[PDB]
């Protein structure tokens, strides 16, 4: 926020009165800058964990498992996966009025192309090297063999993977199809990202609406006051507007600071799930989805990350006598 | 720009980084004025200089319309003994316009002139003439003892002494109905506690100033979204459109680029408003075309610096600005074509756009970073995400580590902050 | 709790690499953790198989992975190349050879057979 | 919080002045509503697992 342009527009009469409030506009600009620098840091700590941009092999002999819906699609220059397209075409107000009233949106440091290239590298490292690219350099392993290590990791002997490998691959491919269908059609799951976008758009809209408030001045329009009154009379009315507009902008900045703290808690959680679910296999019971965690795949979303958590869910239990 | 950085930091040293130093704003090329093309002078002499004024209970009202008013003649006349303006300043009044002006004129006592103001009460304010509490206008009064007195007293001037209620704003009540001060009715005739509601002023020329007659005019200004028909004497300029300008349309002061509008104003509409109450479009009062008002372009001015220990060289980002807009902040020496690069973060001046990618040193945005590098100067580049690598996957190959390195990594965490009271 | 008082299985929680141990150091208003991690190094390519087919039985590693240098097959632990002869002790059987995609033929050394034969 | 009932009680004279501050009462009511909806969500995510 150009705090002077928000409070005063182009009026130097107001700007000179706004100097008498001292550092408040510098405090406001500095708080919003700290929030903005944090948003770059949040994205860096979630996605830029992968130290090399790993590429998938040109031939995808992953033992019957079919990642084509989650691997990069070359047909778009943004190079999103198919499920990333479902997310970016589904989460994604008053920008002109905001821009002309001193409010502006800065671009993120990482573009959506760069974030898609990081998720690309995380997916490639995951399916070609298992957890090993998390701990160190990517060590290749055949996909069915690392899936058999995941089965050992949930305490199912690896022969259960190999003896059922066709079934398990068909079940995985079918479940990725269900991801596509749900994210094509739901109105529920993305509520966490929509809520964040809506809250921020609502906050900027409200801050613009507050420029219509009189705050007890003879007009909300500061040019009415300055066309109609001279300094001694006008200053009382300009000061009413300054008081209420400065309180409006301080309210906005305070609630953005609180929202930024919540978004950082969420980015800390997302970075922890990238490390522990994508770069690892988690023993933590619900941390990487319901069921015993096998592996997770990151997908980018607007201002967000999507984890596709693959889990083993036991089925068709039989009663036995036991000792 | 390094000086604006040092000042905004209030520090002589500057660390490496990118700093908000200023907001850039395009300055106006000229000042427009557009009033309606009216040559008729306003008939103020007719209201201020009549031979006989009204009584305040039956106060006169005259429309002033479709005319040019030089109110400074009124205010700088020495004759008027009070000239009080409300909701407007009498200096500014010579450059406003109004849909109409109502002149209200009457005579009162000198003592009672204090009652002709918004929010007043008293015999005149309550039973004769009420200004609204949010009145815009000027109240003008002068001693008229040389006009409205006579020896033996001027009985021609009356005021309402009693009423069942005090007046609404600009209500008038000429009613001759005999008034009941008594608990019993008056049956339509005078009597005990039953009085004619009007009393005459004693205006003997011998009386002291508090009981001398004062002539009063109230110039009431209707500021409306309706078209102007009374205006100050300021002369219209010609119009200019796409150049950045100050303007005054019928007293709408503002600044912007007066783009010819596509907006489909209905024939009654005079102004357009933004989502904030700022004016978004205006009808020209002479041609009656529609103009957009948009602000002359502006943006944040980030200054990109290595440390002042490393260099005093700095690049400048005009954030969200286009390079076709940056002017050749306070200083004029930038926008030199030798170093211009249109980032999506904004126009970047003073950095060389290199073809390489490196790790991000100073972030600029939308994938751009800058660094100080060799013969050293500011370079701008697309940041590198990391070494691109092929894992060499095969359905039957495994890599197994034959050795290891023991690694020690420092992690630092804040645990407390300073306890203050 | 989890890095100093413990050993964490949580992949990046206690530094990059497999967490061995961590040491706390005080700092102004802060704590410093020195995370000791095992980082694997100097990896080599091996041919690998999910199972060994022997006597029509399918053998899997009890722990570790089957690897070949090109001519012989070994079993080894996943995170450090330490080849072992494939034996009926470091492998377990499940089922016959027909079901495992990519199973390879090799002998599996039974250690009791020669202890009988040498008696 | 009924922001008008807190600031003004039942006075319409005060209510009409409180309109001149614009959306501040709508902001306050909406912030407290978001807090209240979060308290239900917090309990759901702990117990309704
Ligand atoms: C793992 O091997 C690949 C290539 O496999 C080769 O053939 C095998 C049968 C075996 O003999 C391997 O040792 C051979 O290397 C290596 O991938 C190549 O790496 C170089 C860089 O070192 C690169 O220029 C090539 O393009 C890569 N080829 C492919 C197909 O990706 C890989 O480096 C080996 N891993 C290790 C740790 O050495
Ligand atoms: C992997 O799964 C994808 C599911 O999308 C399959 O993609 C389809 O393939 C057919 C041709 O075989 C195309 O006509 C469809 O248009 C593809 N669908 C999409 C959405 O791209 C793919 O064939 C599968 N591959 C294997 C080996 O199973
Ligand atoms: C384990 O569950 C799977 C389903 O998840 C079973 O597979 C299905 O079997 C029916 C016939 O019984 C087929 O028509 C389906 O096409 C199979 N589904 C898949 C995905 O392959 C499987 O039979 C079950 N196994 C046991 C031993 O109960
Ligand atoms: C319009 O007409 C009515 C009725 O003639 C006026 O009513 C008067 O209202 C005041 C209070 O507002 C009372 O004290 C008077 O006694 C009413 N008069 C009568 C005769 O009943 C009303 O004031 C008029 N409005 C205007 C603007 O003239
Ligand atoms: C910077 O301004 C130029 C124009 O001065 C923009 O380029 C024009 O964009 C329009 C589309 O809106 C095209 O029809 C023109 O042909 C373009 N002209 C030229 C010379 O390229 C440009 O998009 C602007 N860029 C930014 C980032 O604002
Ligand atoms: C694969 O490993 C085996 C290790 O057993 C190598 O063969 C052995 O080589 C030594 C000499 O270095 C001989 O004394 C042994 O008799 C061999 N083992 C057996 C079981 O006969 C073999 O050379 C290695 N192959 C490659 C391609 O490296
Ligand atoms: C692994 O060993 C089996 C024998 O134990 C091989 O199977 C034989 O393959 C030939 C063709 O190459 C068939 O004619 C025989 O009928 C098969 N024998 C049995 C018992 O089915 C198998 O081919 C070997 N695998 C490899 C890769 O050499
Ligand atoms: C009123 O009339 C006199 C002439 O009797 C003239 O000198 C004076 O200027 C007039 N005043 C105004 C306000 O027109
Ligand atoms: C006022 O001026 C415009 C030109 O600026 C002209 O077109 C218009 O006819 C004029 N209006 C009148 C009433 O003469
Ligand atoms: C400051 O610059 C000098 C060279 O002028 C260099 O030797 C020194 O290391 C620098 N120190 C810092 C803290 O930048
Ligand atoms: C920088 O890159 C662009 C293509 O991306 C190219 O047109 C330009 O000539 C390059 N400049 C140099 C100096 O290599
Ligand atoms: C690898 O592919 C070959 C064919 O190229 C196939 O014969 C073999 O069974 C596959 N191995 C595994 C482990 O999938």
Q: Which residues contact A299 (CB under 8 A, 6 or more apart)?
A: A70, A81, A83, A84, A87, A119, A305, A306, A307, A308
Cβ C67–B396 below 8 Å, yes or no? no
CA B245 distance to own-chain centroid? 16
Residue A216 distance to chain D (closest CA, Å):
6
The closest alpha carbon to B262, from B243, B287, B289, belongs to B289
Give the gap in angstroms from C-alpha A163 to the nearest C-alpha of chain C: 6
Rounded Cα distance, A95 and B9, in Å: 30
CB C74 within 8 Å of CB C66? yes
Q: What is the CA angle B35-B38-B41, rounded to 5? A: 120
List the beta bridge partners of residue A297.
Answer: A308
| Nearest to A281, CA basis, from A293, A289, A266 | A293
The whole-angstrom separation of Cα A15 and Cα C12 is 51
In angstroms, the CA A131 to CA B370 distance is 34
b/e code A231-255 from CB counts within 10 Å (16+ = b): eebbbebbbbbbebbbebbebbbeb
Contact A251 D21 (CB under 8 A): no
Residue pairs between chains A and C whose CB atoms are closer than 8 Å: 76
Beta carbons of C37 and B415 less than 8 Å apart: no
| Alpha-carbon gap: A235 to the closest alpha carbon of chain D (Å) | 19
Nearest ligand 4 atom to alpha carbon B168: 12
Question: SS3 helix, strand, coil % of chain D, rounded to 5?
Answer: 80, 0, 20
D12, D16, D22, D27 alpha-carbon torsion, rounded to 10°? 0
User: Ligand 4 pocket test: which of B160, B164, B166, B179 has the largest number of ligand atoms within 8 Å of its C-beta?
Assistant: B164
- The number of the ligand 1 atom at minimal distance from the alpha carbon of B390 is 31
Name the experimental technique.
cryo-EM
Minimum CA–CA partner of D16 in chain A? A216
Rounded to the nearest angstrom, the minimum Cα separation between B305 and chain C is: 29
Q: Give how far Cα B412 sits from Cα of A299, B38, B168, C27, C34, Å.
A: 30, 76, 73, 8, 9
B401–A136 CB contact, under 8 Å: yes
What B261-265 contacts at long range (C-beta under 8 Å, 24+ apart), as own/partner pairs, is B261/B289, B261/B290, B261/B291, B261/B292, B263/B290, B263/B292, B265/B290
* Residues in chain B closer than 8 A to A141 (CB atoms): 398-399
Q: How far is the CA of C70 from the centre of ligand 6 (A)?
A: 10
Residue A38 · residue A46 · CB < 8 Å? no
C-alpha closest to that of A149 among A295, A308, A307: A295
Taking CA–CA distances from A217, the nearest residue in chain B reads: B87
Q: Which residue of C has its CA nearest to B416?
A: C29
CB B254 within 8 A of CB B293: yes
Query: Coil, strand or helix: which one is A181?
Result: helix
Q: How many residues does chain C have?
A: 119
- Closest CB from B295, B386, B395 relative to A100: B295
Alpha carbon of A230 to ligand 4 centroid (Å): 39
- Distance from the Cα of D46 to chain A's closest Cα (Å) equals 12
Q: Do residues A290 and A311 lie in contact, with contact meaning Cβ atoms separated by under 8 Å?
A: yes
Strand partners, A181: none
Residues ending a continuous segment of chain A before a break (C–N > 2.5 Å)? 92
**Residue B57 zone, left/alpha/beta (φ > 0; ψ -120 to 50; rest):** alpha
CB contact under 8 A, C67 and B417: no
Q: State the Cα–Cα distance between residues A66 and B102, nearest whole angstrom.
A: 83
Mutate which of C57, C105, C107, C108 for ligand 7? The one with the most ligand atoms within 8 Å of its CB, which is C105
- In this structure, what are the phi and psi dihedrals at residue B348, rounded to the nearest 5 degrees? -105, 120
Q: Give contacts of C39 with chain A, Cβ < 8 Å.
A: 135-136
If you measure from the C-alpha of residue B59 to the centroid of ligand 11, how many angstroms do you get, rounded to a whole number? Answer: 82
Residue B379 to residue C82: CA distance in whole angstroms: 50
- Structure token pair of residue A282: 């988690």
Is D20–A213 a contact, with Cβ atoms under 8 angstroms apart? yes
Among the partner residues B20, B91, B275, nearest to A29 by beta-carbon distance: B20
Q: If you take atom 2 of ligand 6, which residue's CA is the nearest one?
A: C72
- Residue by residue, DSSP assigns A100-121 as HTT---PPPSS-HHHHHHHHHH
Q: Is B264 helix (H, G, I), strand (E, B) or coil?
A: coil
Query: Tokens representing B57?
Result: 């209970």
**Cα B277 to Cα B254: distance, rounded to the nearest angstrom:** 13
Residue B391 and residue A218: Cβ atoms within 8 Å? no
Q: What is the CA radius of gyration of chain D?
A: 16
- Asked if the Cβ–Cβ distance from C102 to A142 is below 8 Å, we say yes
Question: What is the rounded distance in angstroms from the CA atom of residue A54 to the CA atom of residue D29?
Answer: 49
Task: Tell me which residues of chain C, numbers 18 to 57, contact chain B at a CB-CB cutoff of 8 Å.
Answer: 20, 27, 29-49
């Amino acid at each position: 926020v150009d705090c002077t342009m928000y409070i005063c527009g182009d009026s130097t009469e107001c700007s000179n009165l706004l100097l008498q409030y001292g550092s408040f506009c510098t405090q406001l600009n500095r708080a919003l800058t700290g929030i903005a620098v944090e948003q770059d840091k949040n994205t860096q700590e979630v996605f830029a964990q992968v130290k090399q941009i790993y590429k998938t092999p040109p031939i995808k002999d992953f033992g019957g498992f079919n990642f084509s819906q989650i691997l990069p699609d070359p047909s778009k220059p943004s190079k999103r996966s198919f499920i990333e397209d479902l997310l970016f075409n589904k989460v994604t107000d008053l920008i002109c009025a905001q821009k002309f009233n001193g409010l502006t949106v800065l671009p993120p440091l990482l573009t959506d192309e760069m974030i898609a290239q990081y998720t690309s590298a995380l997916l490639a490292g995951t399916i070609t090297s298992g957890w090993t690219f998390g701990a160190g350099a990517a060590l290749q392993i055949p996909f069915a063999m690392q899936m058999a290590y995941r089965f050992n990791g949930i305490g199912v002997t690896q022969n259960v993977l190999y003896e059922n490998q066709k079934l398990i691959a068909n079940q995985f491919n079918s479940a990725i199809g269900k991801i596509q269908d749900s994210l094509s059609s739901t109105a529920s799951a993305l509520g966490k990202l929509q809520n964040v976008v809506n809250q921020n758009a609502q906050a900027l809209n409200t801050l613009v609406k507050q420029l219509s408030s009189n705050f007890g001045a003879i007009s909300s329009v500061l040019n009415d006051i300055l066309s109609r009154l001279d300094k001694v009379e006008a200053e009382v009315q300009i000061d009413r507007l300054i008081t209420g507009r400065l309180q409006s902008l301080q309210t906005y900045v305070t609630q953005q600071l609180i929202r930024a703290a919540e978004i950082r808690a969420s980015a800390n959680l997302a970075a922890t799930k990238m490390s522990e679910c994508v770069l690892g296999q988690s023993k933590r019971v619900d941390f990487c989805g319901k069921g015993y965690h096998l592996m997770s795949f990151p997908q980018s979303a607007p201002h967000g990350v999507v984890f596709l958590h693959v889990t083993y869910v036991p089925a068709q239990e039989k009663n036995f006598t036991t000792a | 720009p390094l000086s604006e950085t040092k000042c905004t930091l209030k520090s002589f040293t500057v660390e490496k980084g990118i700093y908000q130093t200023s907001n850039f704003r395009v300055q106006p090329t000229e000042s427009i004025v557009r009033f309606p093309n009216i040559t008729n002078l306003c008939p103020f002499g007719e209201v201020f200089n009549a031979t006989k004024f009204a009584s305040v209970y039956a106060w006169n009202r005259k429309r002033i319309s479709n005319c040019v008013a030089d109110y400074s003649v009124l205010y700088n006349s020495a004759s008027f003994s009070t000239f009080k303006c409300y909701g407007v300043s009498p200096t500014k009044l010579n450059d406003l316009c109004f849909t109409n002006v109502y002149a209200d004129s009457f005579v009162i006592r000198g003592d009672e002139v204090r009652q002709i103001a918004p929010g007043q009460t008293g015999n005149i304010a309550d039973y004769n003439y009420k200004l609204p509490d949010d009145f815009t206008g000027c109240v003008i009064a002068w001693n008229s003892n040389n006009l409205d007195s006579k020896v033996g007293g001027n009985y021609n001037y009356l005021y309402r002494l009693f009423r069942k209620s005090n007046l609404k704003p600009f209500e008038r009540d000429i009613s001759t109905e005999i008034y009941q001060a008594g608990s019993t009715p008056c049956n339509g005739v005078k009597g005990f506690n039953c009085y004619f509601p009007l009393q005459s002023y004693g205006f003997q020329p011998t009386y002291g100033v508090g009981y001398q007659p004062y002539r009063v005019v109230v110039l009431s200004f209707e500021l409306l979204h309706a078209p102007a028909t009374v205006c100050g004497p300021k002369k219209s300029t010609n119009l200019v459109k796409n150049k950045c300008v100050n303007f005054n349309f019928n007293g709408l002061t503002g600044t912007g680029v007066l783009t010819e509008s596509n907006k489909k104003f209905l024939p009654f509409q005079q102004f357009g408003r933004d989502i904030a109450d700022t004016t978004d479009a205006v009808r020209d009062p002479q041609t009656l075309e529609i103009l957009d008002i948009t602000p002359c372009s502006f943006g944040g001015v980030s200054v990109i610096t290595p440390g002042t220990n490393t260099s005093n060289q700095v690049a400048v980002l005009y954030q969200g600005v286009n390079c076709t807009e940056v002017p050749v902040p306070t200083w004029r020496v930038y926008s030199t074509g030798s170093n211009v690069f249109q980032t999506r973060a904004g126009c970047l001046i003073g950095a060389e756009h290199v073809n390489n990618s490196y790790e991000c040193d100073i972030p600029i945005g939308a994938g751009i970073c800058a660094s100080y590098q060799t013969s050293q100067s500011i370079i701008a580049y697309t940041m590198s995400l990391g070494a691109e690598n092929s894992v060499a996957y095969s359905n039957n190959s495994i890599a197994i580590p034959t050795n290891f390195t023991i690694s020690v990594t420092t992690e630092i965490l804040p645990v407390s902050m300073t306890k203050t009271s | 709790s989890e890095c100093v008082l413990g050993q964490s299985k949580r992949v990046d929680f206690c530094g990059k690499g497999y967490h061995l141990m961590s040491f706390p150091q005080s700092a102004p208003h802060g704590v410093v953790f020195l995370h000791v991690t095992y980082v694997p190094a100097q990896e080599k390519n091996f041919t690998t198989a999910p199972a060994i087919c022997h006597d029509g039985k399918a053998h899997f590693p009890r722990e570790g992975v089957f690897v070949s240098n090109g001519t012989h097959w070994f079993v080894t632990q996943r995170n450090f190349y330490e080849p072992q002869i494939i034996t009926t002790d470091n492998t377990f059987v499940s089922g016959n050879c027909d079901v495992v995609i990519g199973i390879v033929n090799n002998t599996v050394y039974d250690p009791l057979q020669p202890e009988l034969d040498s008696f």
